[PDB]
Amino acid sequence: PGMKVINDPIHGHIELHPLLVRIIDTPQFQRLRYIKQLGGGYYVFPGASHNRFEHSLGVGYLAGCLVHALGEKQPELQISERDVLCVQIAGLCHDLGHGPFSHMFDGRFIPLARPEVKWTHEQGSVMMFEHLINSNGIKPVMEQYGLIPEEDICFIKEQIVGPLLWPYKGRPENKSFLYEIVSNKRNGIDVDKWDYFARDCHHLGIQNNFDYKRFIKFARVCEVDNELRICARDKEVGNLYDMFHTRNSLHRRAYQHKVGNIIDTMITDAFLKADDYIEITGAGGKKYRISTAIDDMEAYTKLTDNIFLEILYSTDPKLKDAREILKQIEYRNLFKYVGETQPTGQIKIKREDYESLPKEVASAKPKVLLDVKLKAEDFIVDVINMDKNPIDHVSFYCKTAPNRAIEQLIRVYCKKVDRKSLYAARQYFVQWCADRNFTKPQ
Amino acid sequence: MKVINDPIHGHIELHPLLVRIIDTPQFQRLRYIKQLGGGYYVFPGASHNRFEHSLGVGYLAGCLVHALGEKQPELQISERDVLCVQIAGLCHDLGHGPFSHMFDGRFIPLARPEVKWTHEQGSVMMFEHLINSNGIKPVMEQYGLIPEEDICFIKEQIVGPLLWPYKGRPENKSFLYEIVSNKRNGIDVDKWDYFARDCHHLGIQNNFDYKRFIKFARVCEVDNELRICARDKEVGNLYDMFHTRNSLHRRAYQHKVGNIIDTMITDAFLKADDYIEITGAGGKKYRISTAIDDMEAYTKLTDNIFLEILYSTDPKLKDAREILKQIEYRNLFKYVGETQPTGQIKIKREDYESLPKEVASAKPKVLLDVKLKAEDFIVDVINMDYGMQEKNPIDHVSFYCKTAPNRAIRISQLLPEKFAEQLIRVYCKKVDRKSLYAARQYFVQWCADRNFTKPQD
Amino acid sequence: MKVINDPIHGHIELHPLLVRIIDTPQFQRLRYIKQLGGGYYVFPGASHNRFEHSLGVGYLAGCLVHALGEKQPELQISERDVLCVQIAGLCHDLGHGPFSHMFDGRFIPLARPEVKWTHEQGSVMMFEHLINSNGIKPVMEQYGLIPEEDICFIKEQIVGPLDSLWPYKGRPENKSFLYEIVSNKRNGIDVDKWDYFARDCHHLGIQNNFDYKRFIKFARVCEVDNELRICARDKEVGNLYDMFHTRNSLHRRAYQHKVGNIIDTMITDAFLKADDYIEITGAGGKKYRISTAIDDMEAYTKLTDNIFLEILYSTDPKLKDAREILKQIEYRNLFKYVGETQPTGQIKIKREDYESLPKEVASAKPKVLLDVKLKAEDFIVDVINMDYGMQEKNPIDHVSFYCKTAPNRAISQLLPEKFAEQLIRVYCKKVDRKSLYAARQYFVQWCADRNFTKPQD
Amino acid sequence: MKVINDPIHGHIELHPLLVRIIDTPQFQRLRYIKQLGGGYYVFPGASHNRFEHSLGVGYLAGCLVHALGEKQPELQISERDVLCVQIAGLCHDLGHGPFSHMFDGRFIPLARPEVKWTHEQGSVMMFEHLINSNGIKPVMEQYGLIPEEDICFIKEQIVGPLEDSLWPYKGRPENKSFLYEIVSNKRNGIDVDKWDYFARDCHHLGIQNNFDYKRFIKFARVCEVDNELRICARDKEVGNLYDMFHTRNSLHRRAYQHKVGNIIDTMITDAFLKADDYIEITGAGGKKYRISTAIDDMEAYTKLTDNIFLEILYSTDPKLKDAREILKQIEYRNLFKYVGETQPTGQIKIKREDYESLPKEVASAKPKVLLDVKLKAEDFIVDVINMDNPIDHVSFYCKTAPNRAIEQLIRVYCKKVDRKSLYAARQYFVQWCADRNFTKPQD
Ligand SMILES: Nc1nc2c(ncn2[C@H]2CC[C@@H](COP(=O)(O)OP(=O)(O)OP(=O)(O)O)O2)c(=O)[nH]1
Ligand SMILES: Nc1nc2c(ncn2[C@H]2CC[C@@H](COP(=O)(O)OP(=O)(O)OP(=O)(O)O)O2)c(=O)[nH]1
Ligand SMILES: Nc1nc2c(ncn2[C@H]2CC[C@@H](COP(=O)(O)OP(=O)(O)OP(=O)(O)O)O2)c(=O)[nH]1
Ligand SMILES: Nc1nc2c(ncn2[C@H]2CC[C@@H](COP(=O)(O)OP(=O)(O)OP(=O)(O)O)O2)c(=O)[nH]1
Ligand SMILES: Nc1nc2c(ncn2[C@H]2CC[C@@H](COP(=O)(O)OP(=O)(O)OP(=O)(O)O)O2)c(=O)[nH]1
Ligand SMILES: Nc1nc2c(ncn2[C@H]2CC[C@@H](COP(=O)(O)OP(=O)(O)OP(=O)(O)O)O2)c(=O)[nH]1
Ligand SMILES: Nc1nc2c(ncn2[C@H]2CC[C@@H](COP(=O)(O)OP(=O)(O)OP(=O)(O)O)O2)c(=O)[nH]1
Ligand SMILES: Nc1nc2c(ncn2[C@H]2CC[C@@H](COP(=O)(O)OP(=O)(O)OP(=O)(O)O)O2)c(=O)[nH]1
Ligand SMILES: [Fe+3]
Ligand SMILES: [Fe+3]
Ligand SMILES: [Fe+3]
Ligand SMILES: [Fe+3]
Ligand SMILES: [Mg+2]
Ligand SMILES: [Mg+2]
Ligand SMILES: [Mg+2]
Ligand SMILES: [Mg+2]
């Protein structure tokens, strides 16, 4: 069986089964070369040039390592070569659905452009994966290696987006542990996070003391509360604490960076101003816009970070408004940071209300008379989401007896950089916080 | 003063003047040009761009001058000098085009053989455009720079002298010209960065330590010229440098599939060249091969042109697109063989275009079952350093003693052999079993009458 | 199967047999002896003991055989061999005494000039004492070792052969490369040095540019003049140059430290003054003294750095003279430094003459005669050897390299000059301005009369 | 001025006054006491001693005062202050006994339950003894120190206020309050002492340390917080502090709280107790003290170091046979076996005075199904491990507007290693937990 070997800066040599190679070499997979992992992060962190493509190879690699390690150590689990491939394909394809600049796309842009629509890149990954297998005739290739397509493709989608009393149609309840590999949000520990923790740390120059190889050699499937779940050896606990500290550090230092997130709302603002005028040719030659390409995977296949440059380089005076914001990024005249607040206890601010937020802020009236008035378009309101002692939700096992177990941050920016426009914005913002019952700004 | 965190160097502090230069459309362009060109399509970690490389070299440039200045106040290194050395480091790669070395090393030679073009020339041109467009000269004067001398100094550090040849600095500061680009012994801050950075991204170990070497550098008189010298105990570090360089050339820059892919991208650019319009100065329209003539058009020419071609519906570009679609589907030119010009004169850029027809015209002894025209051949010339003959860089490094600084130590089989090479590879665009068989002996016969080495089996 | 975490080597996995040997009074004894002896009284970070160094050498020893055995199966390296190399690594320093090299390099020579003793000899004796006392031989057999072949192999790996006939009884000549692992006296490259270079550096805060992991990765056993020997890959030459400079740095900065050595002679002076009065109970209940404790391993087992505090804390008025010298160390009233000389182009001083030396200094005739004169008891003469009883050799000569394309066959004033020196220093026990002036003149005359080099100012 | 090369801090410069203080039997003593005590028997890199740690803290304390005095000359920081903070840094651990925290944390409570003893108290006593014994007061005066003003300040920095809501410190006025936050800060637990041993313990244990103290010192400022002058961090140095706290948590989890490490420290303690009666240390006036009584006289205590371990191990004396055999069990690596772990239930802390009673409570527990072995109190070891988010108790300041701010673990070991003794000890232990209402031991 002919394997491709890929040298990876994080995992070293990655061997790829011919089936994975066929899936990798499609316009739909190669597309991920053109989407930055951290999006606007790159404009803060010069080392963060990495793309979704290499990350996905990693997740596919690690996904395989874990199933195979489990299968070798516990043959009773009945893990087939068919299972290993399906877990690897899920690992490979879990991010197919991301759009330009990754989380900026499904996390801010689509909510702003089309508030009524519900879209996640996970939903995209399932759609794009379906599009991928159909477009490139993957089903025969699967059958050749013993995969049964209607049976397994379902499994794969479920590993990505979740169940489409045992909710899963792709595998029976006795293999339930397989669903904990690629995406696990019970305890938020999975091969996806293992790759991007190590890979972001590598490109951001942040210290990562978590050893994922250790964790995989010692992973075991044990019965917990009637349920088969992946468990860690008890003395790997110190390792787990290192993982959680690495994750916290990536969030405070990188994902939540004040300038990083500012720049991402600027790229978003430019997309919104370009949305009317940009045409992406989809299936049947129909034309979609940036916000609608998610509706058709053929158009969406051509929607990547390139759209940034398409806007930047364009001559069309209709795109002038979009273009000048991107030029603002280039010249580094950025939105200025007004303040930060949290919603107290309560309910989370929701994506469908994102569009409404700047108008709420501008409609606040601070109690001292202010001689500057600011429109709602003068404001940017940025909703940043986060996800306890995390070690309690991890299940462990003892060596001597295995098979036995033992959040919203809200920032506001102003497009006006002169002092008393900025002074005004501050007053709007503190007042808005007061009457929406948010925490009082520093 | 801005601080930028970098995975190779850690914290890079930037003087306000540098920040002014960096925050321009001409510098930010380098975010959109991959360092290793087609390398990325082989090494998934090699997503890095010219931008971060440039910040790095500007930073290393600064570290080295500053280190010398503190250890040797007699050198009379001014703060004016250090900023100039930093800007040169920062701007040395400004002239790179889409996919870096693919552009000036193959594409331009194929498109416009008559023209002589290096990205270094581009960097000097682009640096001028950056300064004029963004009014940097007043900002230079503000910080104590004299624009007409210092701008010359900076350009000279990049492309060399435009009987002491340099107009930008006198002969007593000559050692400053050894920092950004050193052509004698190839030891400079530019290589230190991309050695460290490429290794970081390729997952190849770099055993050269630049911090050690910078700590111990001195300027000493050697053959009545001021030169940067290494202390004697650094000999081991320099050998590691020369070996890291070899690994990078052999494992990465010369990678067979990587270079095939660079010829596919180039083949795509050529087939797209007539029909693509880039808007330059005075609203004039330029092509990919022509964008080098105007810095305003060239500012808009980056790797993006690959995707512009790939996503395009225009049927005039269908041919360019079909090659780029081939790369995505991973049906690539197939590799015929490799040969070297031993004892003969190495192939020159102006002759690259002619090479495929020589191959198609070879006429092998046996009758062929399939005939191949030159459309079908790709001939790739791979140079370590183009237009440089072979030198042992260890010779041109001067060392100094603990007990006798300020004077060099007076001056093997374990070093890398080859420091400037020419490799000639041939690929065939037809992938069927008997077309390829044809291509091989066309190639073997082609080698024979140019008296190149007989391809190994 | 125990794993022990180490700050230099990370995780060290220990075969049960090694653990069994380690968990004995004779091995745990090494916890109580400082690696650098008096170095600690100058380098506060140098708290490390023989114990952790020995685990390291055991670890590195195992790493190298395994790397050789796995890459070159033709060498037929057995599990029996790997264990024996590990035991040798672990036990090579068993024989060190209180404050390490102070003990066999100075104290014993001064106490018993007649005796020829090395700590390596000690290691052989202590290893024998260890295996007998703790019933290791059955445990050896249990794991596939043949005790009187292997114990012999292990001892020979430590102390050497017990003309040009093959001297080793423990292993045949086709495995000869095994004897190059723990102790290599031809080129001074072995796992012992690797560990303490890295370990001493770590505690002294000195940078270690030698990477042993790399060297082990690339090591091969090849043909050299009839002879099977461990060889380095050609690209590792830079790493070996770094090893030699680190060694030179450690020797110059730490082992030859002025105060460090003054303090070790003070401790020795204390031991001598205490030697008559301290009984250590050995085998058969017989009583041994500090200097005779080397005669019986049961007594020697209880002889560690502890003897320093025993003397210091003692009430016995017999011990007051010894005690007072150790107390002067605490108060930092030390022997004062007179000067340094070398026996260049002369015959080097031998251990059996050490005691005679102060008498020679005190008997020199300095004159112009001075109003102060000194007895021999007022002088301390310190002989500092890089390698004792070893001729000056350049070690890169005697290292063989190999080429990739010829996997098996073997193929410098940028290097340290210095590989075997004798340094002779003189201290004076009297601290007044005029005695000190007198002692200098005695010393300068003594140098002249032995035709050693003239003391500097 | 002497320079000392140190593997953690690089070159450390020592003022002549400090050198005078260092070169005494009372300070040099710390060369003979392991930082991590029994830790060395688990972690071979942990050979470091109190001596080098104290130089470090003396060095860092100085770096911080000097950085403050220079960036804020309005703050009144004199050279007299800088020297006094350095001495406090230098001498803060003078009071540690054999194997450090084993001595004051377990041994002394077991030997003399009635006595209240901390090594910080020792440090103050030993420091007084150091200055008197060696004639340090004149030397202080040469360099501008006033001995009974300053000695008081130095002691206060170490043991805290000696003798409510008034300003408790006599050694410095309240406008110097920030000085008392440098060497020892109980309030928020961030000081030069921890910085040193976090970095030093990590270096010797091979644990990665991401906290950079040098940056933190560069950005430190004194600001007004609630009536009070206090040391503050620049606001986005918050990230550095999180790394410090992660290092602290890791060191407690991987090292200080290590199972075998602590077990061996109870074995050393058990040997000391059985040796206590018979060992004589000569104190002042030729008076003889015991291991446990040496804390009562600093001249005796001066000669009490890790050496006492070997004195026992090497002794021929048959009264010491019991002590010697325990230490021999350590050497042969036959160790007390781990029975279980529990935590006391809400609020209540087991107190040092009651430690002795704990093995007898356990042994007197009535496990309810009856078992074939009975165990004495001497068969049990009860080990109480005390813990020394945190960002809320740190005060920060803004760059643009500085001046203004923005449990217990209980383990049980059994000394008899035969299998069914262990089954028994387990049942004694689970039951003891039950009727003292501690958390139920995991299975
Ligand atoms: N100016 C600039 N900074 C960069 C770039 N890439 C990374 N950085 C680093 C430097 C600081 C950080 C962002 O700095 P900004 O220029 O956004 O500074 P700011 O915080 O918006 O403005 P200010 O510093 O005035 O508050 O990211 C770049 O291309 N230009
Ligand atoms: N700025 C921003 N960051 C986000 C958003 N959602 C998540 N992040 C941060 C938190 C984690 C990090 C990566 O997200 P995931 O944990 O989903 O990892 P991923 O591999 O990128 O996502 P997935 O595999 O689900 O596509 O990015 C968002 O909407 N906006
Ligand atoms: N197939 C493939 N390989 C990749 C990719 N990215 C990196 N690589 C690595 C693995 C193999 C190497 C390129 O080799 P190819 O797969 O093109 O193989 P080839 O030698 O050209 O043809 P073949 O092996 O089919 O005979 O680079 C990718 O997207 N697809
Ligand atoms: N594919 C390809 N690679 C090249 C060519 N010329 C050089 N290379 C390889 C060998 C070294 C590396 C570039 O080294 P340079 O010293 O030119 O460094 P650079 O930073 O890329 O360019 P600059 O000289 O402008 O700094 O890329 C070429 O024409 N084509
Ligand atoms: N004084 C002293 N120095 C130490 C100690 N530990 C390490 N050192 C370093 C500092 C200097 C070196 C020993 O130098 P000494 O002060 O003993 O000798 P010196 O340098 O000639 O000092 P001086 O000229 O004052 O006598 O070792 C210590 O405990 N006391
Ligand atoms: N002070 C002193 N230093 C010595 C003497 N002999 C050697 N040294 C220095 C030079 C090297 C360093 C260690 O020497 P070794 O190579 O013997 O190494 P070791 O590991 O200490 O002992 P062994 O050879 O038994 O392993 O100590 C001596 O007699 N006195
Ligand atoms: N045996 C032994 N282990 C050591 C030494 N130094 C460090 N270690 C490490 C290796 C294992 C770790 C724990 O010690 P042990 O394994 O002896 O104790 P344990 O693990 O509780 O005993 P066990 O697992 O055999 O019941 O300590 C040493 O000198 N001897
Ligand atoms: N075994 C044991 N460890 C302890 C005890 N108290 C604290 N520890 C651990 C946790 C932190 C580490 C050092 O604590 P300290 O903050 O006291 O630091 P120190 O330098 O050792 O002592 P000091 O407070 O006098 O400076 O030792 C104890 O009572 N027993
Ligand atoms: Fe992902
Ligand atoms: Fe460059
Ligand atoms: Fe050794
Ligand atoms: Fe302390
Ligand atoms: Mg291939
Ligand atoms: Mg900024
Ligand atoms: Mg164990
Ligand atoms: Mg001295």
Numbering used by the authors:
A (entry chain D): 113 to 276, 284 to 506, 512 to 530, 547 to 582
B (entry chain C): 115 to 276, 284 to 532, 538 to 583
C (entry chain A): 115 to 276, 282 to 530, 538 to 583
D (entry chain B): 115 to 277, 282 to 506, 513 to 530, 547 to 583
Provide the publication's sentences verbatim.
Human SAMHD1 is a 626 amino acid protein comprising an N-terminal nuclear localisation signal, two major structural domains; a sterile alpha motif (SAM) and an HD domain, together with CtD, a C-terminal region required for interaction with Vpx isolated from SIV that infects sooty mangabey (SIVsmm). The HD domain contains the active site of the protein and in combination with N- and C-terminal sequences also incorporates the two allosteric nucleotide-binding sites, AL1 and AL2, that regulate the enzyme through combined binding of G-based (AL1) and deoxynucleoside (AL2) triphosphates.
To identify residues important for substrate binding, catalysis and tetramerisation we determined the co-crystal structures of SAMHD1(41–583) and SAMHD1(115–583) with the poorly hydrolysable G-based nucleotide analogue, dideoxyguanosine triphosphate (ddGTP). The SAMHD1(41–583) tetramer is symmetrical containing two equivalent dimer-dimer interfaces. In each interface, interactions between R372, D361 and H364 form a hydrogen-bonding network along the whole length of α13 (left, and S4A). The same α13-mediated dimer-dimer interaction is also observed in the SAMHD1(115–583) but in this case, only in one of the dimer-dimer interfaces. Given these variations in active site configuration, the nature of the bound metal was examined by recording anomalous diffraction data from a SAMHD1(115–583)-ddGTP crystal at the Fe absorbance edge and by measuring the X-ray fluorescence emission. Inspection of the anomalous-difference electron density readily identifies a first series transition metal, attributed to Fe.
